[PDB]
Design a protein that fits this description.
Chains A, B: Pathway: Amino-acid biosynthesis; L-cysteine biosynthesis; L-cysteine from L-serine: step 2/2. Chains A, B: Keywords: Amino-acid biosynthesis, Cysteine biosynthesis, Lyase, Pyridoxal phosphate, Transferase. Two copies of one chain form a homodimer. Chain A is α/β, with parallel strands linked by helices. Chain A folds into two domains: 200 residues, 3-Layer(aba) Sandwich (Rossmann fold); 103 residues, 3-Layer(aba) Sandwich (Rossmann fold), CATH 3.40.50.1100. Chain A starts with a strand and ends in a 15-residue tail after the last strand. In chain A, strand 8, helix 7 and strand 9 form a beta-alpha-beta unit. Chain A has a six-stranded mixed beta sheet. Chain A contains nine helices and eleven strands. The longest helix of chain A is centred in the C-terminal third of the chain and has 15 residues. At the A-B interface, strand 1, strand 2, helix 2, helix 3 and helix 8 of A face strand 1, strand 2, helix 2, helix 3 and helix 8 of B. Bound molecules: ligand AA5 (2 copies).
């Protein structure tokens, strides 16, 4: 394949039939989003948000994009903005992966650091605050903007179907902003009412009423129920334990050469769990958002 | 694309015509080998090496593979040996990228650390010594084994020609083992004598008689002149400065969303340099062996 710009490599990621032991002898399919130029499923979102921002006449040549992110979206966004020569300011909460930040910076963005404890909420508050002091500015707001799920709706979703060798029994996915799950579940359920949708979250997330605290799994986890969920018939909301997610990261890497992040491990943990209360010979599809190489600074592969 | 195992992702890497300013208004094409499952062009060698090892009846189910690597070859070899249930011991000099080491152990290899000052030469001596204490063992020996250049000869080389939109004026490549350069130059020069072959080494490397010292650029650099060089007519040997390599690593990421390792920077450095003693409108092809995300622990993006 011959490419001119890096943006061409966004999407069209492989779908792998994990050569692993699945209960009731069913099959789990994962989309290796880490093969995106920026190394995360977020690359898609980023390009799309900026596109939407342009088409809606809310962004121009000298506009200053400001957005709260945990890092991966910041990367996907910085890549897009970089392509359009758009000044970028990313607001990210203090304790997230060093590499994401270095990468964000490396791609040309300017990071604003909010207190670890304030989480995404503080980052969002801070982004909007700054947006109000910068006249020519646009805040994509990936946690509310509908363009978010719309993004995965026309790219990811169709791509999953195209590779699937059979009817998708269920679709498990991790949720950070929710965008990925929603936008894809939306498309899949609207092509087969049967496809059950399942959201996954780390212990310490609110999606299941649990108490709100900090988790070791990174990338997923919510601090308020995501607005993009009324477009999907949520068949079940699973809360995966930290050790469970990481244990999977370790295994997949040691037994099937799969370098996957925690969010990806949590997804696999969830998908394998759902496999038990599902008909035999079923067909589950899930998403691995990024590589474990992105969390090597956190000793991801340690116990 | 639907895949069964990760090994199916090795190779068929994109060829990018870098959207950058070039001397004499020529063009530089780079093969983004960081898109391999293991994140490096080494994935190729690792597979081929073990493959050759089997066909030559030098490897069996219970054999212990021992190889001196700087990390990448080790990762690719770990993948391949993991695929055949082969025990792996990788001898790597002390000061190479941490991530490479983590990945190597996470993939299942066992690392043996040689002194940083002894370099690859200390790594080789140690490999061979260990190899002689283990009866059923095979040392692929990427620095001497002809399977090395051969591996890229039938994969990488053809791949380049496949996408190249015009005759290749010259092919610039970094050298660590020599393999990649020799292998690809060999094929290319035998498909067009006009195609010039240029090797690239970091300051501190012996190719140009320089004094032998430690360099910041990682992945390339030789401590003896690689034997695979008699198969190619070396048209020029460029020794690239550390700052030069890294300055490119910085630029491509801040201007064209390209996350590249130092080895890929020295490469671009040398390629652009050559564009100045080459006809106008020329066509140069080079190779970016791995991502910058692999040297984040080393502050790759810092000045
Ligand atoms: C915690 S919050 C965060 C958000 C995003 N992410 C995100 C993510 C996910 C989810 O996805 P969504 O669309 O749902 O958000 C997964 N994984 C991973 C790794 C990631 O990073 C960013 O980055 O900004
Ligand atoms: C002494 S040097 C070392 C060798 C290998 N590498 C290698 C490499 C290169 C070169 O390639 P070659 O085939 O020539 O060796 C580049 N880059 C990168 C990143 C890398 O890692 C290993 O790893 O072991």
């Amino acid at each position: 394949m011959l490419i001119q710009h890096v943006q061409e490599l966004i999407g069209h990621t492989p779908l792998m039939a994990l050569p692993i032991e699945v209960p009731n002898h069913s099959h789990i399919y994962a989309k290796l989003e880490m093969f995106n130029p920026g190394g995360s499923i977020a690359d898609r979102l980023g390009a799309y948000l900026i596109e939407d921002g342009l088409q809606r006449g809310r962004v121009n040549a000298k506009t200053t994009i400001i957005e709260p992110t945990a890092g991966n979206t910041g990367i996907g966004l910085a890549l897009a903005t970089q392509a359009h020569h758009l000044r970028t300011i990313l607001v990210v909460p203090e304790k997230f992966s060093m590499e994401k930040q270095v990468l964000m910076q490396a791609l040309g963005a300017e990071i604003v650091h909010t207190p670890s404890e304030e989480g995404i909420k503080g980052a969002i508050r801070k982004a909007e605050a700054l947006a109000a002091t910068i006249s020519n500015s646009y805040v994509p707001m990936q946690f509310k903007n509908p363009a978010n799920p719309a993004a995965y709706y026309h790219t990811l979703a169709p791509e999953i179907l195209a590779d699937m060798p059979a009817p998708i029994t269920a679709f498990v996915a991790g949720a950070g902003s929710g965008g990925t799950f929603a936008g894809v579940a939306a498309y899949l359920q609207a092509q087969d009412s049967a496809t059950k949708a399942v959201v996954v979250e780390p212990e310490g997330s609110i999606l299941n009423g649990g108490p709100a605290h900090a988790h070791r799994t990174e990338g997923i986890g919510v601090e308020f129920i995501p607005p993009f969920f009324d477009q999907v018939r949520i068949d079940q909301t699973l809360t995966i334990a930290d050790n469970d997610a990481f244990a999977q990261v370790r295994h997949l890497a040691r037994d099937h050469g799969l370098l996957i992040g925690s969010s990806s491990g949590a997804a696999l943990a969830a998908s394998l769990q759902l496999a038990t209360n599902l008909p035999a010979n079923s067909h589950i599809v899930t998403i691995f958002p990024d590589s474990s190489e992105r969390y090597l600074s956190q000793k991801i592969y340690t116990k």
